[PDB]
Each structure stands twice: as structure tokens, then as C-alpha cells.
Amino acid sequence: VTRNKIMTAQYECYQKIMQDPIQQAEGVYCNRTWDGWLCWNDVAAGTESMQLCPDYFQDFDPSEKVTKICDQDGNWFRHPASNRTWTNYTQCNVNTH
Amino acid sequence: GTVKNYETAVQFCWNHYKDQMDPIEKDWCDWAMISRPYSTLRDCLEHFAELFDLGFPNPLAERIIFETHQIHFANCSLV
């Protein structure tokens, strides 16, 4: 079920990444990407996209939010430690509240 | 052991995924028919990424997932 919800979410993200790229639209922004669990649409630089937490796991709260920063240079925020593109899922776990 | 690095790890995954998909050219746009090789390809690419201590997603992995979407799914809808 959960595996199904994830591969399905993933396949669609990529279908769009591949078949519905931002055309022309000059300026800077963050291009659509699959962070591994959630798909994120193209957004203008200096923005903070957000969504509800994936219904994937049971210790996750669908009511909680998920965040992802796209900076002014039009590049998705990378977490400083490994310096890989990063989505903030720190608020999804029920027991951390 | 054919996996000697992430490069070869990805080839291993890619070739095993291709072996699973070739016999079903007609069913490529059918989730019931592809969900397993596809889901199994994700697992392979991510499990070896862990094995070489790389994150997931990672560039080399996505390039491969980009590949299947080009050669296998470019003709299907978003389902």
C-alpha cells in the first residue's frame, strides 16, 4: 500500500518533470523535483513551498506540514551537513510534538 | 561480485530492470505490469546508494530513472 503510494507519486512526478517542463519562462526559479517522497512543482526563487505530510507511514501526522525552500538563486535549499537538496520533514513525526 | 562501485551498482540495477521490462513492451503503460520492476528498480538504486553511503535520491540514480521515463514511459500518461 505505502510502497504503492510512493512509486505512484514518484512515477507521476517524473512524467511531469519529463513531459511538462517550464517553457521559455525566463528568470530564475526552482525546477520541478522528486525529493524521494514528495513531488514539488516549479517555483519562483525565494519561495517556501509547503504540503501536508505523506500518508505513507503511521507515525506520520497527515495534518502536519512539510516545507521546502527555493532560494533567490533559483536553487532548492541544500541542508548544510551533507549539502544535498533537502526537504524539511522534521515536523511530520507525531511523537516529536 | 559485479558491484564494485555505484557505477557498476547502477548498471546491475539497470540491466536487471531491463530484463524485466523487455518481455512486456506492450504492457509498458500498465501499472499492474510495471509497478514491480519499477518499484524494484527504486529499491535497488537506493539500497546500493546506502551501501556506498550516498543519499537518495542522488544524481546518478535519477539519471537512470530519467532514462526509463524516456525509453519506457514517454508514451504513457501520468498515472
UniProtKB/Swiss-Prot annotation, chain A:
Protein name: Calcitonin gene-related peptide type 1 receptor
Summary of the tissues where the protein is detected: Predominantly expressed in the lung and heart.
Record's subcellular location: Cell membrane
Annotated glycosylation sites: 31, 83, 88
Oligomer and partners: Heterodimer of CALCRL and RAMP1; the receptor complex functions as CGRP receptor. Heterodimer of CALCRL and RAMP2 or CALCRL and RAMP3; the complexes function as adrenomedullin receptor.
Organism field: Homo sapiens (Human)
UniProt lineage: Eukaryota, Metazoa, Chordata, Craniata, Vertebrata
Extracellular membrane side: 1-97
Similarity annotation: Belongs to the G-protein coupled receptor 2 family.
Residue numbers of the full-length protein present here: 36 to 132 of 461
Annotated effect of mutating residue 57 to A: Strongly reduced affinity for adrenomedullin
Disulfide linkage: 13-39, 30-70, 53-92
Disease entry from the Swiss-Prot or TrEMBL record: Lymphatic malformation 8: A form of primary lymphedema, a disease characterized by swelling of body parts due to developmental anomalies and functional defects of the lymphatic system. Adult patients with lymphedema may suffer from recurrent local infections. Impaired lymphatic drainage in the fetus can develop into hydrops fetalis, a severe condition characterized by excessive fluid accumulation in more than two fetal extra-vascular compartments and body cavities, placental enlargement and edema, pericardial or pleural effusion, or ascites.
Top-level taxon: Eukaryota
Entry function: G protein-coupled receptor which specificity is determined by its interaction with receptor-activity-modifying proteins (RAMPs). Together with RAMP1, form the receptor complex for calcitonin-gene-related peptides CALCA/CGRP1 and CALCB/CGRP2. Together with RAMP2 or RAMP3, function as receptor complexes for adrenomedullin (ADM and ADM2). Ligand binding causes a conformation change that triggers signaling via guanine nucleotide-binding proteins (G proteins) and modulates the activity of downstream effectors. Activates cAMP-dependent pathway.
From Swiss-Prot, chain B:
Summary of the tissues where the protein is detected: Strongly expressed in lung, breast, immune system and fetal tissues.
One term under GO cellular component: clathrin-coated pit
Principal location: membrane
Location of this chain's protein in the cell: Cell membrane
UniProt keyword list: Cell membrane, Disulfide bond, Glycoprotein, Membrane, Receptor, Signal, Transmembrane, Transmembrane helix, Transport
Function: Accessory protein that interacts with and modulates the function of G-protein coupled receptors including calcitonin gene-related peptide type 1 receptor (CALCRL) and calcitonin receptor (CALCR). Required for the transport of CALCRL to the plasma membrane. Together with CALCRL, form a receptor complex for adrenomedullin/ADM. Together with CALCR, act as a receptor complex for calcitonin/CT/CALC. Together with CALCR, also act as a receptor complex for amylin/IAPP.
Homology family: Belongs to the RAMP family.
Protein name: Receptor activity-modifying protein 2
Organism: Homo sapiens
Name of the gene encoding the protein in the UniProt record: RAMP2
Shown segment, full-protein numbering: 56 to 134 of 175
